[PDB]
């Protein structure tokens, strides 16, 4: 067993490995959505930028977790990364709703991880989640919610005008 | 015969002269479209800027080819430049669709030129096309396609609002 | 009829369209001459620069006229652009003499246009010609005349030395 | 079918989708190796930096291909990303040899893709591979080969001294 | 066999070694011509500069090829470098004509190398030639052709005045 | 006979031509060694840099001599440049020992040239050797000797560790 390990339960170690896989999956989902808005029959440059940025942020989530794992003494075990549910996201509104759903999923997974960490009385891991992950998910969900509300009040996804204007006036700057 | 000529088939020379004429024709077409959007009963300043820029780019395409011709030892033979098909382009959407069609035309002509160059085992001419022309046409077509898709999703050419907003939010910056 | 049109006779409109075509033709002629001096069996870099610059200046002449047309309420009607008289200009001296002739041609066409403008009592169009075109042609003709005189006093086109030195000492800087 | 598609064979489209998946797989492999050198019982910071950089470069390979796909008119179809062959890479030397093998694999896949592109007479796609991928793989293989040779001449993986010094004197700067 | 070798035919390897030798030979020829214009009974400083620069450029051609060879897995085999055909180049015009001939020779050798590379379906080597060698030879030949034409139209090599003026007005700046 | 010649014995002229050939040969030898350390199965970047620099320095030795020759009134006569003795230099230590031997050879040739120059009472040529060549060879030999001693005291060429560390700690900076 690793010389640095201390107060690191194997249940925690397994949760960390699962969370790593999930963050990588989310990165894959966001990559999918981004290049779906790059298509010549969708053509929403700023939606594409937005989801590409979110993809890279989830990738950094994963890497932060892997470094945490090696720091505590656990061992990283990588699994396959599943293909996203869809290859075609229909609209900007629907991609936003999907992203909101995905982030609520990852949030619940993190909440159960923090619960397991408090239960195995691992306060350092509990605070690592408290600091680097919980509030980022709260912000991400509130932001996606704002986006969904605005796109809806504009008549998306019926009005193609709505998505075109949103792309310019919100996801530009 | 010119002292510099080497491995330059006369079939290639004829193709180059034809491509020169075609690039000049395209420049004329884009000039037409540009000043059609300058009209007081159309009045789309940014459409006008866009097609004027594209006109000058095609002019430089032609000049690059003429310099290539003199470099290989061929001789430039200029022909008349035909008037564009139309004097009135109806709308911004229709001008975009016409431009997309014209660029697919010039692309197919360039592809047949590259084929002829590979067949007469003229690798320098093949790579000149590979480098300075093929990818520029791929980019131009994808861009015009984006423009057509967006203008359509906004309700062009019915909605005059759509073309007015596109002119400002996409062809401005 | 266009909402901006005022005091713009249709005879003037036709003259403007013809002058546009002629300026474009001249641009084509200068393009021809330029790349004739780019040939490996002529090889006069500064002659080439000179006629390329003159080509682009005539192109701007045309565009200025097209904008004038749309400003007055007329409608631009583009015609074919004829191939230059020659594909081979023999020498620097002969190209200069041809250019002088072409500019005297375009000058006479502009003078008849100004006459028509004064006759249809269109003072704005008369002054547009007075300002942006007449004096430029006077300068261009005097300059080409200087060039022809110098090239002749040097023994062009017999002396190839003469054209080589002129290219360096006059068309360089 | 997409409005921009021209001369893009569906066999090419399938090859592109497969190459995208493979570049993503390679990125996953390099991520694995990197965080294997982050372990407290391996502890080779510069090996870790090296393979993390290579991971991000392969990720950009994938994204470049996805943008190419949307540009030509094809449609991106994402598949699962397989877990790397190993979870434990034994040594710096063995990780280098594995990386060399993986890059020879991806190189052969790209070579067969270029062959298919030349056969379906798709010169733009052939040159896209020629430019953005072939030489990068030649460089990567020669570099990994240098690394393997040096690590071997130093007595890796027996001598832990060898890997420690290589980490500092080659992968530092 | 070298660990990096992949898709590198031994016929290609032999062609590369021969091309290395030929580029070195050309460098030797240009060195010869340069210091022939340094002689007190020729005394053409700018001709000398010109051919010395061209000598060093051919030397870099050779070195680029040697690095390519080691990159693909081949092995560099150096041969003797033959003395130039002449020790006395008669005139500036004759040196230029000789240089034009030599560059057409090396161009044909490179063209046959590119043919062999396309035939052994080595696209990376084909593109290495396409990029770093073919167009440089096209430019070099067109430039030498310009020089020969100008020197001839000035009455070289009879007129010593012609070569003296060319040295100053073309090979200076 | 050349108008500038004064006190320049033909025996000296022949010695100069031979020394030119020898400096060029040495440049070829150093080029060989350099790209031998570029091989993926040798891979000593700094050895490669070192011998490439030495190659270019010998090339400048040759050119300095050729300019000296034209200055005194002699005539440069170029001969073939022989291939180096070896195509494979075994190790860094052995390349260093070979280079030391080659520089002692060229030094003895220069010493006999200075002797011939003092004997034909050519003090300018004697001092040209004294200044631009003798001390450079003394420095080069002492430096190569230092290198050989250090590589030996480190256990080269047995210890591959020794050559790897020398490459970094001495030939880097
Ligand atoms: O917050 C707690 N530990 O940190 C906790 C959870 C349940 C209990 C308990 O058993 N109360 O009776 O305590
Ligand atoms: O056999 C052939 N046609 O029937 C053939 C000759 C050369 C090529 C070719 O261009 N390969 O890349 O193909
Ligand atoms: Na290419
Ligand atoms: Na006035
Ligand atoms: Ni996340
Ligand atoms: Ni509690
Ligand atoms: Ni074009
Ligand atoms: Ni004009
Ligand atoms: Ni890759
Ligand atoms: Ni060369
Ligand atoms: Ni082929
Ligand atoms: Ni020397």
Swiss-Prot record, chains A, B, C, D, E, F:
Q: Name one GO cellular component term.
A: nucleus
Q: Which GO terms describe its molecular function?
A: ferric iron binding; ferrous iron binding; ferroxidase activity; identical protein binding; iron ion binding; iron ion sequestering activity
Gene Ontology BP annotations: immune response; intracellular iron ion homeostasis; iron ion transport; negative regulation of cell population proliferation; negative regulation of ferroptosis; negative regulation of fibroblast proliferation
CDD domains given in the database record: Euk_Ferritin
Where, in this chain's numbering, is Fe cation 2 bound?
Answer: 58, 103, 137
Q: Which superkingdom is the protein from?
A: Eukaryota
Please list which residues make up the signal peptide: none
Q: What is its EC number?
A: 1.16.3.1
**Binding positions for Fe cation 1?**
23, 58, 61
Subunit structure, per the record? Oligomer of 24 subunits. There are two types of subunits: L (light) chain and H (heavy) chain. The major chain can be light or heavy, depending on the species and tissue type. In the human liver, the heavy chain is predominant. The functional molecule forms a roughly spherical shell with a diameter of 12 nm and contains a central cavity into which the insoluble mineral iron core is deposited. Interacts with NCOA4; NCOA4 promotes targeting of the iron-binding ferritin complex to autolysosomes following starvation or iron depletion.
Function recorded in the entry: Stores iron in a soluble, non-toxic, readily available form. Important for iron homeostasis. Has ferroxidase activity. Iron is taken up in the ferrous form and deposited as ferric hydroxides after oxidation. Also plays a role in delivery of iron to cells. Mediates iron uptake in capsule cells of the developing kidney. Delivery to lysosomes is mediated by the cargo receptor NCOA4 for autophagic degradation and release of iron.
Similarity-based family:
Belongs to the ferritin family.
What is the protein named?
Ferritin heavy chain
Protein's organism: Homo sapiens
